[PDB]
Structures are given as C-alpha cells and as structure tokens.
Amino acid sequence: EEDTAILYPFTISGNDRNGNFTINFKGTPNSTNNGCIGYSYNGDWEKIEWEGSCDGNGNLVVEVPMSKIPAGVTSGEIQIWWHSGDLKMTDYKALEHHHHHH
Ligand SMILES: C[As](C)(=O)[O-]
Known part of the structure; x- marks a missing residue:
C-alpha cells in the first residue's frame, strides 16, 4: 500500500467538518x-x-x-x-490549514 503510492501525510482537527478538503496536483498535461x-x-x-x-x-x-x-x-x-x-501534490487546504508542499 504505502510502498507503491506517493504519500503526503496530514493532520486535522478531530471535530471540525465544515467545508472541503481541497488538494492541488501538478502533472503532465492531460494525464489521468x-x-x-x-x-x-x-x-x-x-x-x-x-x-x-x-x-x-x-x-x-x-x-x-x-x-x-x-x-x-x-x-x-x-x-x-x-x-x-x-x-505531484503542491498544496492542500483543509479547515484553517493552508499547506504548501515545498
Ligand atoms: C502552514 As505549512 C508549514 O503546513 O505549509
């Protein structure tokens, strides 16, 4: 599982479930x-x-x-x-956390 996937750990609030978990990926144009x-x-x-x-x-x-x-x-x-x-993942935003992947 871990070994074949590209991995990006995160932590979040246990309680707050408003809004979206939004993730930005960058990759080959028109890739699937x-x-x-x-x-x-x-x-x-x-x-x-x-x-x-x-x-x-x-x-x-x-x-x-x-x-x-x-x-x-x-x-x-x-x-x-x-x-x-x-x-690759470049960024995600979930709840109040605005994350950039360097
Ligand atoms: C606010 As950060 C250190 O998750 O990009």
Missing part, C-alpha cells in the same frame, strides 16, 4: 490520475477515493467534502495511486 485521502479510524485504514485529469496547464484540483472524514479522525495521508504521466 487517481488516489485517495486515507486516514485511520478506530484501527481501520479508510480511504476516500479521488480521480481526475490534469488540464492543459498541468493542473488538477480535487475537492472532497470534509464531511466524508469521520469525527475523531486526526491524521492521514493523501495518496497518489494511478498517474499516467507525472503527478
């Missing part, structure tokens, strides 16, 4: 891609799947409602699974 927002919940690893294509500028914005992550969850990993060309 998928992955998840994974997290631990009561000792299970749960996955919210995402998928999309990069546009002509190489950009892919993924939006996942925060409501999909159960209350009490405080940590996880954004993962890239399939990437037809190149893909």
Whole structure:
C-alpha cells in the first residue's frame, strides 16, 4: 500500500467538518490520475477515493467534502495511486490549514 503510492501525510482537527478538503496536483498535461485521502479510524485504514485529469496547464484540483472524514479522525495521508504521466501534490487546504508542499 504505502510502498507503491506517493504519500503526503496530514493532520486535522478531530471535530471540525465544515467545508472541503481541497488538494492541488501538478502533472503532465492531460494525464489521468487517481488516489485517495486515507486516514485511520478506530484501527481501520479508510480511504476516500479521488480521480481526475490534469488540464492543459498541468493542473488538477480535487475537492472532497470534509464531511466524508469521520469525527475523531486526526491524521492521514493523501495518496497518489494511478498517474499516467507525472503527478505531484503542491498544496492542500483543509479547515484553517493552508499547506504548501515545498
Ligand atoms: C502552514 As505549512 C508549514 O503546513 O505549509
């Protein structure tokens, strides 16, 4: 699982579930891609799947409602699974956290 995916750990509030978890990916223009927002919940690893294509500028914005992550969850990993060309996460915003991946 971890070993074949490209990994981006995160932590969040256990309580606040307003808005979206928004993720910016940069990659080959017109590539197709998928992955998840994974997290631990009561000792299970749960996955919210995402998928999309990069546009002509190489950009892919993924939006996942925060409501999909159960209350009490405080940590996880954004993962890239399939990437037809190149893909990397550059940024995400969840709740009050504006994160840049250097
Ligand atoms: C605010 As930061 C250190 O997660 O880019």
